[PDB]
Design a protein around this ligand. Structure first.
Ligand SMILES: *[C@@H]1O[C@H](CO)[C@@H](O[C@@H]2O[C@H](CO)[C@@H](O)[C@H](O)[C@H]2NC(C)=O)[C@H](O)[C@H]1NC(C)=O
Ligand SMILES: *[C@@H]1O[C@H](CO)[C@@H](O[C@@H]2O[C@H](CO)[C@@H](O)[C@H](O)[C@H]2NC(C)=O)[C@H](O)[C@H]1NC(C)=O
Ligand SMILES: *[C@@H]1O[C@H](CO)[C@@H](O[C@@H]2O[C@H](CO)[C@@H](O)[C@H](O)[C@H]2NC(C)=O)[C@H](O)[C@H]1NC(C)=O
Ligand SMILES: *[C@@H]1O[C@H](CO)[C@@H](O)[C@H](O)[C@H]1NC(C)=O
Ligand SMILES: *[C@@H]1O[C@H](CO)[C@@H](O)[C@H](O)[C@H]1NC(C)=O
Ligand SMILES: *[C@@H]1O[C@H](CO)[C@@H](O)[C@H](O)[C@H]1NC(C)=O
Ligand SMILES: *[C@@H]1O[C@H](CO)[C@@H](O)[C@H](O)[C@H]1NC(C)=O
Ligand SMILES: *[C@@H]1O[C@H](CO)[C@@H](O)[C@H](O)[C@H]1NC(C)=O
Ligand SMILES: *[C@@H]1O[C@H](CO)[C@@H](O)[C@H](O)[C@H]1NC(C)=O
Lengths: 49, 49, 197, 99, 99
């Protein structure tokens, strides 16, 4: 079917067609951030006397 | 050191031309030379994605 | 020079495309090299530069319009000199100085316009004088050792005998040549004269 | 810069495109010239350094010889050929019956 | 086959060739005949005999210090000039340099 879409046809002639590449999909995601626990000094920056 | 020069085009030579004189070879040799020609190049395809 | 015109800000922005500029010149260099190779493949087949003998008879055959003319500053035959005076080239030398383009503004010389935008025309390796020497060597060979100098050693053959073989080659008996040698030489000489005209 | 670089990039892309167009055309032309040069080289060997039997290769008529002359950016060959002229109508036969 | 095209199948007179393969191409070994040692001889277009003009049939008339012989063009091998090695046409008053 990939060949049929590439060729814009519902009929494919005898021969060899290239069909993209072998691909795999990711199954899960990984999120990595440093384990910073303190909140930024929003108070000091925005609530200053 | 690097030198520059006018290139030579070939050896100086001449033919002993005369209206009543010929040269005829009396012996011969067999020479075998080598000629090298490309026939093909690399076959490729590209996945643009 | 073509793209930025020495603008500094452009030159810095253009750095990201430097790999494209390199590729453009690799292609142009490849062409330029092939042009000298083509010249050698055509004219430098024989590396023996054979001298034209002091002129001796060739049995009535007159080769003066194809052989180099010794009175000229450049040793071209009368026909070659004609060919050189008909094809017109873009310039007449490969040296154009900044001071010549700077001084003569009024001319609006296209050659200067091309140089100021980074478009460069390079000289050939073989000059017209060197090509003329190769051509003359081939003629000297053809005339004094016809078709043998190109096979190996150059073996002298009287010009009329070379013609006899040429006639056997096309398919007529050689006695035709000798019996009609004067006529043949005259028809030949006439034809060459007509070509120059 | 926030705007100037856009305008400059439009021009850089356009000028590179013009140069690529030029190079491509020169490569195509160069290939055509090479083919001509190869033909000229072939003729030098077959028309000048020998006698060719190839019809119309070294000019019209039966080839006898040729002489190169140089020209700017090329070669000019003078091809000397034999051409049949006055002719007559004769009767013929494949063979003769004798005894 | 055997080509008669000058310098097409290598320098010299072509005898034969053998292909060898190579990555992405072909290499040909071209076997050719090359004239070697040579000598200076006197010549003449034809021989004047009994008033008739004798032309070589397959070769040239060649002479050493005292005698005329007829040889094949590409290899010196002197033959006695006989009526078999020549053909006759015309006479002694036409050919220039007849001996
Ligand atoms: C080849 O032909 C040319 C003519 O085309 C000969 O040159 C002429 O020579 C006469 C003297 O005999 C002069 O009066 C003419 O002015 C010359 N003509 C030209 C155009 O220069 C030349 O001598 C001939 N060469 C041979 C070897 O036969
Ligand atoms: C073969 O053709 C040649 C010309 O191509 C003839 O030669 C000419 O003959 C006339 C006779 O009136 C002369 O005036 C010319 O000067 C000759 N030309 C040349 C170049 O010499 C020749 O006569 C013809 N032969 C035969 C048997 O028909
Ligand atoms: C030209 O060739 C002939 C033939 O080979 C030479 O004459 C012969 O010489 C030998 C001696 O070497 C004699 O035995 C023969 O009887 C001679 N043959 C004839 C027909 O006389 C001749 O000497 C050579 N000439 C030169 C100048 O080298
Ligand atoms: C700023 O101060 C007020 C009290 O006046 C408090 O309610 C508010 O949360 C403070 N804002 C921040 C960002 O700490
Ligand atoms: C041969 O005969 C034909 C008859 O129609 C004539 O037209 C032609 O000119 C003749 N050719 C020659 C060479 O005499
Ligand atoms: C002459 O030709 C005729 C045919 O027309 C044939 O029968 C006869 O034998 C020939 N005569 C010979 C070869 O003497
Ligand atoms: C033929 O004679 C010339 C005379 O100048 C000489 O230079 C040449 O070497 C001789 N060739 C042979 C093959 O003996
Ligand atoms: C020998 O040559 C002369 C010319 O030098 C000629 O007059 C004479 O007839 C010839 N003798 C023959 C063929 O017997
Ligand atoms: C060669 O030229 C001389 C004049 O130098 C002449 O006497 C001789 O007959 C000519 N020979 C031939 C074969 O033309």
């Amino acid at each position: 079917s990939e060949t049929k879409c590439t060729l814009k046809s519902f009929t494919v002639e005898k021969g060899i067609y290239q069909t993209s590449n072998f691909r795999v999909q990711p199954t899960e995601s990984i999120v990595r951030f440093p384990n910073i626990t303190n909140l930024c000094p929003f108070g000091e920056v925005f609530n200053a006397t | 050191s690097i030198i520059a020069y006018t290139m030579s085009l070939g050896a100086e030579n001449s033919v002993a031309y005369s209206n009543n004189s010929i040269a005829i070879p009396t012996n011969f040799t067999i020479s075998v030379t080598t000629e090298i020609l490309p026939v093909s190049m690399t076959k490729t395809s590209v996945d643009c994605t | 020079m073509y793209i930025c015109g020495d603008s500094t800000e452009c030159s810095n922005l253009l750095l990201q495309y430097g790999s494209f500029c390199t590729q453009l010149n690799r292609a142009l260099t490849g062409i330029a090299v092939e042009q000298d190779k083509n010249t050698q493949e055509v004219f430098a087949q024989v590396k023996q530069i054979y001298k034209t003998p002091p002129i001796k008879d060739f049995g009535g055959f007159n080769f003066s319009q194809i052989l180099p003319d010794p009175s000229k500053p450049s040793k071209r035959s009368p026909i070659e000199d004609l060919l050189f005076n008909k094809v017109t080239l873009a310039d007449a030398g490969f040296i154009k100085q900044y001071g010549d383009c700077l001084g003569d503004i009024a001319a609006r010389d296209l050659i200067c316009a091309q140089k100021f935008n980074g478009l460069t025309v390079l000289p050939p390796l073989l000059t017209d004088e060197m090509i003329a020497q190769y051509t003359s060597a081939l003629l000297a060979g053809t005339i004094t050792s016809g078709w043998t100098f190109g096979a190996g050693p150059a073996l002298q053959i009287p010009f009329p005998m070379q013609m006899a073989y040429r006639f056997n080659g096309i398919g007529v008996t050689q006695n035709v040549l000798y019996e009609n040698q004067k006529l043949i030489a005259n028809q030949f000489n006439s034809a060459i004269g007509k070509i120059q005209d | 810069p926030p705007e100037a670089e856009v305008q400059i990039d439009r021009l850089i892309t356009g000028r590179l495109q013009s140069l690529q167009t030029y190079v491509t055309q020169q490569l195509i032309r160069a290939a055509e010239i090479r083919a001509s040069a190869n033909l000229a080289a072939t003729k030098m060997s077959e028309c000048v350094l020998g006698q060719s039997k190839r019809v119309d290769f070294c000019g019209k008529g039966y080839h006898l010889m040729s002489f190169p002359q140089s020209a700017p950016h090329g070669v000019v060959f003078l091809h000397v050929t034999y051409v049949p002229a006055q002719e007559k109508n004769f009767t013929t036969a494949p063979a003769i019956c004798h005894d | 086959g055997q080509s008669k095209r000058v310098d097409f199948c290598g320098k010299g007179y072509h005898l034969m060739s053998f292909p060898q393969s190579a990555p992405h191409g072909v290499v040909f070994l071209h076997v050719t005949y090359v004239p070697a040692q040579e000598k200076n001889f006197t010549t003449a277009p034809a021989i004047c005999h009994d008033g008739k003009a004798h032309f070589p049939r397959e070769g040239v008339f060649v002479s050493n210090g005292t005698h005329w012989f007829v040889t094949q063009r590409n290899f010196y091998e002197p033959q006695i000039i006989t009526t078999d090695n020549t053909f006759v046409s015309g006479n002694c008053d036409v050919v220039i340099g007849i001996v």
